[PDB]
């Protein structure tokens, strides 16, 4: 819990709306499926699909975007016999997720008010590609924020009385 | 308003608690103090200053951080004749705002619970030093976060009865 | 010359490989195309467009990358009654550009060796994305390394003779 | 070799010269000296060694600096009972290359024109702090830049006559 806080804390971040996330989630699973070559016979099980995703996640950028080849470069760092299974994995669960972010809708479209303004809610994830797909891939939660501002005047000195 | 949250929604941003602001306020203001010389004698007006100010800023680093030497150069880009007024100007607008940070505390104390756990205060600023310093210095309000999570399982759907 | 190589040290730097730097092109492009609703009639003078262009700049994303509607939103900072203007000479200009970019491969092709060890070139751009469209729309020159490395035993003491 | 380039082509990277890199090994030295508590008993070993510099990396800032305080909470991720040994190793391996930095000095100042231009030299290293103390500590190379630049007119189209 305060650990995913202390790993945002530590790294540039990101705002992302409702619809920009999902929309994220249409351009990797959309990328990745231009990967998909043949299907796969086998497949990973979840101990042997974290390592893989490991080594994937080690060969994606750390820069703020990938494209296809960025990601097909990636797939490369993955042990060959496991690629198609890897592959077919990463999608399903992007696909999974990717149903379920439709749902912050709901909490995100419950008013609040921070310093007497409409605080606006959005997930907060890292910069960096690397680091955010896993985020996303792997982490069992998702931060957010509830976005205001102070404004300066509001933090001069007004009396004792308060 | 949202003028400045788009601001922030449109770059790498930096969670801050109120003792790091207060901290980087610290390590900000003794560096300029070294590249004090001469006192100044005559002053900038707020419209001399902000154009000072500019190409300043604009000479900053967009690295996250600034080194003495980094600030120092950049003091270098304001016209010779406005610099030692530019840089006493500087340094007295930084110390005002300095004390005004501690007033944060109040606001970042108030309790709230976001999603059901207890929702962290935390300052919202630019990941870039020219960026985040531009802001501090001449905008009139700064922005804050409360910070949560979902747990996807949250997201997973439960059913036709809410 | 040394100015913008001063403007690479002080903030987060890419490489980007000749056909890296050409897809770019291609895609922020295509993107723009995408936001041309009718042909302009008047022109922007050079002075005019310069003008506009700051403004568009200001408004495009400080992450790496940018998408249609990061675009498209910074194209409504334009001044109205230019924009459709602003746009199709953004474009042209871009266009133009496009095509020259093919002849870094003439020089990106001219073997070297430094330290001991074929040296690839790499064209050398801003991290950001404004600060990058910006170098690549208006400045006269593009930036370009020839990368190596040193191996640290290379670095270790090896005697008084050298 | 061409592993540790590709490794910064997908990450931001940041331009340092001699000096600044020397000054950094300065700073990042003496922040972890503050740390320092009893000395150490037993020494850990290569094996082991890297095990806690995983560990230690991981909880370090990927943003583009670290401050005391963040060097020494991700002290905190080592085993504590391997904490103290952990602690002084790495300043003995930091102060060590501390010193085969000065040796850059040789190649740096080896003169070298590219597109007709003087080229520059710079250490290139990765924007993230926790990235670029991992290559400075682990990898057995250090990556460089000669710097240069094309102009646009350069890359006009110039006849059919070369």
Do not use: C
Request: no cysteine.
């Amino acid at each position: 819990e305060t650990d995913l806080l202390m790993k945002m804390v530590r790294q540039p971040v990101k705002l992302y709306s409702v619809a920009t996330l999902f929309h994220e989630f249409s351009e990797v699973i959309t990328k990745l499926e231009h990967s998909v070559q043949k299907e796969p016979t086998s497949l990973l099980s979840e101990e042997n699909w974290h390592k893989q995703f490991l080594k994937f996640a080690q060969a994606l950028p750390a820069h703020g975007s990938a494209s296809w080849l960025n990601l097909d470069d990636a797939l490369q760092a993955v042990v060959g016999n496991s690629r198609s299974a890897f592959l077919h994995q990463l999608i399903a669960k992007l696909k999974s997720r990717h149903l379920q972010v439709l749902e912050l809708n709901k909490i995100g479209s419950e008013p609040l008010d921070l310093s007497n303004l409409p605080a606006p809610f959005y997930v907060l994830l890292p910069e960096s590609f690397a680091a955010r797909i896993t985020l996303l891939v792997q982490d069992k939660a998702l931060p957010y924020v509830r976005v205001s501002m102070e404004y300066w005047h509001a933090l001069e000195y007004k009396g004792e009385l308060n």
